[PDB]
Amino acid sequence: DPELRSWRHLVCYLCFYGFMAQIRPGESFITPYLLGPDKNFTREQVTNEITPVLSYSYLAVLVPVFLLTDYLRYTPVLLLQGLSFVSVWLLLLLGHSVAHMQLMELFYSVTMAARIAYSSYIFSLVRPARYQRVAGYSRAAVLLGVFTSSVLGQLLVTVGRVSFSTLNYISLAFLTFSVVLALFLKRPKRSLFFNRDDRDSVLARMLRELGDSLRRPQLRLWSLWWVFNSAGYYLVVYYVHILWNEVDPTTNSARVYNGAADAASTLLGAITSFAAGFVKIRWARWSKLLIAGVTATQAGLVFLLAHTRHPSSIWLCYAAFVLFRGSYQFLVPIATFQIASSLSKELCALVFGVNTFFATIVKTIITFIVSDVRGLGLPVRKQFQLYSVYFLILSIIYFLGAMLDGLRH
Numbered sequence: 520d521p522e523l524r525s526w527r528h529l530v531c532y533l534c535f536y537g538f539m540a541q542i543r544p545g546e547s548f549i550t551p552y553l554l555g556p557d558k559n560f561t562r563e564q565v566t567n568e569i570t571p572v573l574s575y576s577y578l579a580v581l582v583p584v585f586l587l588t589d590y591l592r593y594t595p596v597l598l599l600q601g602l603s604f605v606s607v608w609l610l611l612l613l614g615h616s617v618a619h620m621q622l623m624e625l626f627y628s629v630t631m632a633a634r635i636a637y638s639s640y641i642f643s644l645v646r647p648a649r650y651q652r653v654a655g656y657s658r659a660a661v662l663l664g665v666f667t668s669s670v671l672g673q674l675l676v677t678v679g680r681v682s683f684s685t686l687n688y689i690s691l692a693f694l695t696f697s698v699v700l701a702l703f704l705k706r707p708k709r710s711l712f713f714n715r716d717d718r719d720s721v722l723a724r725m726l727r728e729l730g731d732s733l734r735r736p737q738l739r740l741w742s743l744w745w746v747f748n749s750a751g752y753y754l755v756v757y758y759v760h761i762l763w764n765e766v767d768p769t770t771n772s773a774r775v776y777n778g779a780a781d782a783a784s785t786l787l788g789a790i791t792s793f794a795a796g797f798v799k800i801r802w803a804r805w806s807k808l809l810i811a812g813v814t815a816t817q818a819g820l821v822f823l824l825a826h827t828r829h830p831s832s833i834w835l836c837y838a839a840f841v842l843f844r845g846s847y848q849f850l851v852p853i854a855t856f857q858i859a860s861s862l863s864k865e866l867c868a869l870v871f872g873v874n875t876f877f878a879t880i881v882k883t884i885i886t887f888i889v890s891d892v893r894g895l896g897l898p899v900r901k902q903f904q905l906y907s908v909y910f911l912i913l914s915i916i917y918f919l920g921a922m923l924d925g926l927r928h
């Protein structure tokens with residue numbers, strides 16, 4: 520019975536890997552682990568020398584991983600994402616110098632770019648008639664994994680009183696187990712670009728379908744949002760754990776609550792993702808007021824992160840990042856619907872690959888100027904005031920783009 524065996528030995532294992540690949544309990548507790556008494560890094564040493572390598576090496580490996588993703592048929596890049604995770608935690612636990620943690624962010628930016636591998640692995644593996652049911656279970660097993668990665672990381676630190684050194688040994692056990700699970704994934708019979716079937720062309724038709732889809736007003740509006748707002752969003756997510764260690768420094772690792780602000784951000788990120796399926800098609804004409812109403816909210820919540828200084832007001836900084844990462848994930852289902860509306864799969868993986876590359880270009884520019892010790896070397900509180908201005912400048916562009924479009928004659 521190959522029908523029932525493919526839903527109990529393949530799909531049930533596919534939603535078991537995607538659950539077990541996204542479980543790293545010490546992933547939110549990386550920056551408190553570096554700044555704590557285990558590694559003894561200065562706060563000005565991981566915000567100007569370690570974390571800007573996460574933005575540089577992401578630019579360097581975004582194109583070679585995406586080309587190796589479709590060439591190797593998506594399975595060894597899920598093994599490369601698993602092996603780079605093990606190589607990140609083997610540098611957290613064993614590396615001590617400032618150069619080893621720059622190598623840790625090089626292996627962490629591999630996993631950050633090879634994350635799409637799994638989301639495009641399901642498209643090339645399962646049949647198109649039964650894709651929206653398998654990918655519906657697969658994303659609901661990843662999102663259940665990301666939630667339980669930050670809950671299990673929080674319950675061990677807070678309830679279990681497990682220190683950060685023993686937590687990363689636990690996270691190393693869930694990552695060596697996810698390498699073993701990634702070895703038994705079935706390679707798809709076909710890929711999207713380099714291993715297609717039925718080999719007018721795949722490049723002459725794609726550069727003509729792009730020429731008739733680049734003139735859509737809803738594609739240029741949401742690709743320009745994906746370049747600039749998704750780059751300033753990821754500049755907050757990298758540097759918000761160095762800011763929570765600046766607001767409330769403890770070295771008392773049972774009151775950190777970086778997993779409770781990474782599980783409630785996934786839970787709010789799943790609610791606002793679910794609540795954007797109605798607005799995705801309903802609020803498409805008012806698509807610049809929707810960007811300039813959320814980016815103005817993100818310009819306030821980033822400024823709220825840069826303004827709190829008392830250690831008793833740290834729970835405002837958690838609720839100004841859960842609301843920040845929750846309001847960004849409201850716009851992404853609206854963004855991926857308006858961009859990938861009339862686009863073929865071969866072009867949807869190219870437009871979102873160009874949008875993620877141009878976001879990483881304009882993230883590398885801000886990380887070299889504002890964040891790195893070569894450009895300016897600004898501390899994290901004097902850097903979030905430059906991301907709140909960047910979000911406010913971005914918010915009064917879509918709002919002034921809405922006055923010049925709504926009140927246009």
Ligand SMILES: Nc1nc(=O)c2ncn([C@@H]3O[C@@H]4COP(=O)(O)O[C@H]5[C@@H](O)[C@H](n6cnc7c(N)ncnc76)O[C@@H]5COP(=O)(O)O[C@@H]3[C@@H]4O)c2[nH]1
Nearest residue numbers: 634635636638639661665749788792793847848851852855
């Ligand atoms: N409701 C909803 N529909 C979407 O299409 C979508 N795409 C992203 N998101 C969420 O918004 C944020 C944007 O991160 P980015 O997309 O740049 O990195 C993404 C992206 O590079 C990759 N990825 C996720 N889904 C896909 C997908 N369908 N196809 C290709 N790549 C994907 O894996 C990373 C993490 O995604 P999620 O951790 O599941 O939630 C994301 C994320 O929190 C979405 N939320």
Ligand SMILES: Nc1nc(=O)c2ncn([C@@H]3O[C@@H]4COP(=O)(O)O[C@H]5[C@@H](O)[C@H](n6cnc7c(N)ncnc76)O[C@@H]5COP(=O)(O)O[C@@H]3[C@@H]4O)c2[nH]1
Nearest residue numbers: 635642654658792793851852854855856859867868871872
């Ligand atoms: N909750 C949730 N989280 C997600 O990450 C996600 N990704 C897609 N979906 C929805 O499930 C279905 C799967 O379509 P597929 O993903 O193969 O094409 C997707 C996907 O390949 C691509 N894409 C979406 N997000 C990203 C992303 N972050 N990065 C690169 N490519 C992406 O653009 C297409 C548009 O999908 P949406 O029209 O926005 O809703 C999808 C869709 O209904 C998601 N739902």
